[PDB]
């Protein structure tokens, strides 16, 4: 997207290096660090056979989806709202993933702003 | 316009593009006369043996028998130990054998060097 255009054609310091987010300390800038919690526990998370890529923060919205899908067999046309909840969490996972990328980008912009102002101030 | 179609060993030049084909002349005119005349006799006695009612056998082709001898037995009777054959014999003979010797020995000593202090991993390498 746009990030690729600025990173490659232009300066790459304004764009995060794709293998390194987050670089700036997450605690700095984020008070009240009540870290991202889990509604499901690894016990039933293991008992419900879930592939590691599917073992994301949206885990609670796959397990119950697999439940109703199994119990509604063979009515594959049912269990859509539960499916609707699933991609909504994955959507929420994606937006907060965008927030993390842009937070790094804004810190990168601020990090340059802090340094040159401190550099050529004399 | 269009430069040419340059022939090669595997991309031969067609008779249509052949200049000498379009350069017909009297002395080569009679030269192509016996081409078919030789062919005509070779088609005559072949067909004569081909359609003979009492022909119960295989019509031996002297050209085929000549080809077999030339490619199977005649090579040494007309071989000459000229210098060129020696380089070709040496390059395609002990050449690759010693080349693979350098490759195989180097790995074997390298592998033996690595295991003798245990860098190579044989945690589950038992079926040697």
């Amino acid at each position: 997207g746009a990030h690729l255009a600025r990173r490659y054609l232009g300066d790459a310091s304004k764009e995060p290096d794709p293998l390194r987010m987050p670089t700036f300390p997450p605690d700095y800038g984020f008070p009240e660090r009540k870290e991202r919690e889990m509604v499901a526990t690894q016990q039933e998370m293991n008992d419900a056979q879930l592939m590691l890529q599917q073992r994301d923060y949206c885990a609670h919205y796959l397990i119950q989806l697999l439940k109703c899908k199994r119990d509604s067999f063979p009515n594959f046309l049912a269990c859509k709202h539960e499916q609707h909840d699933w991609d909504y969490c994955e959507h929420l996972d994606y937006v907060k993933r965008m927030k993390e990328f842009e937070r790094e980008r804004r810190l990168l912009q601020r990090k340059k702003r802090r340094e040159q102002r401190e550099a050529e101030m004399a | 316009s269009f430069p040419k179609y340059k022939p090669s060993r595997l991309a031969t030049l067609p008779a249509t593009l052949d200049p000498a084909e379009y350069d017909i002349s009297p002395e080569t005119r009679k030269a192509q006369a016996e081409r078919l005349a030789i062919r005509s006799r070779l088609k005559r006695e072949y067909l004569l043996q081909y359609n003979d009612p009492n022909r119960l056998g295989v019509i031996e082709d002297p050209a085929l028998i000549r080809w077999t001898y030339a490619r199977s037995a005649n090579i040494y009777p007309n071989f000459r130990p000229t210098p060129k054959t020696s380089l070709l014999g040496a390059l395609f003979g002990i050449g690759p054998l010693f080349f693979w010797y350098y490759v195989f020995k180097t790995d074997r000593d390298k592998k033996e060097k690595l295991i003798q202090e245990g860098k190579l991993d044989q945690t589950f390498n038992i079926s040697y």
Binding site: R70, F73, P74, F76 | -
Partner: protein, 60 residues
Amino acid sequence: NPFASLTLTTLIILTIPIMMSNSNIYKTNLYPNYVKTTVSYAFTLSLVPLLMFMHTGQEM
């Protein structure tokens, strides 16, 4: 429990036409139709393992 038997049969029942062919009992004509029925019946046999799969998901 059924999963093992049904899928294995889909393999076994696919090979009788080969052995009957070696028996030469087939008087042509009927053989291509005979082959089609075996493959078609192999397909129908191959369903009930598949419908089993989505119900639970067991893989053996």
